[PDB]
Symmetry: D3
């Protein structure tokens, strides 16, 4: 379905470096539709749930600490295969090993400061969206450019 959605968050380092518009521009050009958008400084509560998956790891605390250290730009994009597509556009965990052309490949150098996060699955996406956004904050009726899907 072309109605798939994913959650993307530009971390405090991405915001601080002025990469928000550049990042949004990439997904806009790809043809994905913005369904939700907002800047905010996450609470520890939100941060702990978002990173629940790494809670057994020692670096979990560092993650939670940083994400709540400054403004975060939260977004929801809609489109066919957007979850996997968004991840490909982001690159890999290590920005230094990410290919030129991808977001982290073009702008990142440290794992601990890798600019942006994207849901790694539909289930994960579903969870994160309901975590960061209230249903009323999401576009209900969505219509991509008419030249995008056959």
């Amino acid at each position: 379905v072309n109605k798939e959605r994913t959650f993307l968050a530009v971390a405090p380092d991405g915001v601080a470096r002025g990469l928000v518009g550049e990042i949004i521009a990439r997904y806009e050009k790809k043809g994905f539709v913005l369904v939700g958008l907002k800047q905010l400084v996450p609470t520890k509560d939100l941060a702990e749930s978002h990173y629940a998956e790494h809670k057994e790891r020692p670096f979990f605390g560092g993650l939670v600490s940083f994400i709540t250290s400054g403004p975060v730009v939260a977004m929801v994009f809609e489109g066919k295969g957007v979850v996997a597509s968004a991840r490909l556009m982001i690159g890999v965990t290590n920005p230094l090993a990410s290919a030129p052309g991808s977001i982290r490949g073009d702008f990142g150098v440290d794992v601990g400061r890798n600019i942006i996060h994207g849901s790694d699955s539909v289930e994960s996406a579903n969870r994160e969206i309901a975590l960061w956004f209230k249903p009323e904050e999401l576009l209900t009726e969505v219509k991509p450019n008419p030249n995008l899907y056959e």
Copy 2:
């Protein structure tokens, strides 16, 4: 003061044409700091107050109708002389008469579809910000790049 703020709104046509990231990128590069950001579909109530200034004019109704016809990306930027600066970067009322380099000059062709709106004064900016944003939605402590102001 470098703490001046202005209200910018990418109208439904700007959003529909995928120009949000491109527009945000311009103000980010200029050095202005994003203090508020969110996408939404404005209510007639919000739309009528926002355009209060043209309420005696017949085109007022067309304005209100269009702004509420689709998603709008609302933003607040902070910085020295940002109100006047943002307007210069946008161009003039008629996109066709706007200089290449400005937003409307580069992307617009019709007055009725001129992509983005920016407060025309500090007083107007003050009013519009409190209209579109709740205080809790705005960044309290702001810190621009350290190489921007002497």
Copy 3:
């Protein structure tokens, strides 16, 4: 009317410097629709008529000589106020005095090599189009992005 059209020609120097896509991209982003397009090496006959206006001037010969010295990319764009708009985007006769943001302002330095030409009027545009293109080479039914005109 939003059906106005203008003739644009990237001269041999613009082509040689690889500026064709960059130039077309500017008018595409503005919202104008490509109605005709083709690369060719103009004949002296076509060149003399195109520059008829300067035929009494001594530099007329230099113009005709250069335009026929290499490939030229001929185009027709459609849209509201496109004739005047296209000229503004091009800049002024002297590339050095053209504003940054305009085509010649960004890429030119010599009057004798000013990259591109655009009709200076509707009447001139009408004449040039019929000069460079056969009616069958022009798009009949044109439809701009639906978010461009109110």
Copy 4:
């Protein structure tokens, strides 16, 4: 030989989305020389021959139908290894699986709307060029930037 040539066609969806200049700009920057260029609305006849290879497949009809549904920008580029090079720059069949940096990777989301087509071989290129262009429409003497080949 640096005189190799390939056929590239921006499909109706690429044209409709205003990606022509952007696409041409990529091949220009790479150093390839434009030998042929023109916009046109293909006839069913031309469309059926162009896609002859898929004529035994059921999706063949959909291909022919779409390519003839709107304007197409046809081009011929010359240069060393241009056929294989152009394909790499385009990406793979599925735009969603194409790498960021490639044309489809940056702008496409659906197989049925993958923006551009490029010959997959020299033999195929030879055939397609003679299909879309008349010999008189192609540049005879070509000269790339002098700093491109040793």
Copy 5:
């Protein structure tokens, strides 16, 4: 003469903000040729002579202090009317009043941090070049793109 030259210096703030390549790219695209280039941290001695013109003004000290506070990228560009042209591309003294499209117009907000300096005259250019560069550091034989001058 197309052999005119001007001195351009990206101040410590321009370097710190990662705008060097972007700035050089603008003059390269314009067609001007780089005749000298180097990064360095200026001595007070060099700084005082460079700003000699403002030595009677109280802000003179602030200028000298800042330019020597970090790395500076010094460059010399050659071309027709480059001195006046370079200034137009830079913008005006107040970055906030500079037009979008110009360097300061796109990236600056404070007079005290206006990214780059360019000689304001041929005489001034002549003086500054001999101030920052040794003759052996400048290209002797220069050859612009052959499609730039008639």
Copy 6:
């Protein structure tokens, strides 16, 4: 360590094609810090040592001849994993086989004219830096953007 450094040289073909600013801009955006920079026309002596590794090969002479045929822009960048990172951003030996997004992938077509060179190892980097730069020409105290490393 985030203090790793690598040597990058834009060959005469890269300079001649006006790609210096574009190339520097890529490494600046990545977050690497410029520690050394200068344009020069290398002597045969410098050229022979730089290419010492291929001195037993017949193409060695062609390398030395070309690098000394025109201006070269020499640079030193600092950052975590910059040596390997810079190579990834450059692409592979054959520009035609380099991925879109990488420097050679976007701008090159011939092995003998592949725009830029980057040290292939820390040891090689150490050697090349001391070859092209004098210690006094390199920045001593370096400070990347504060949002780059955790």
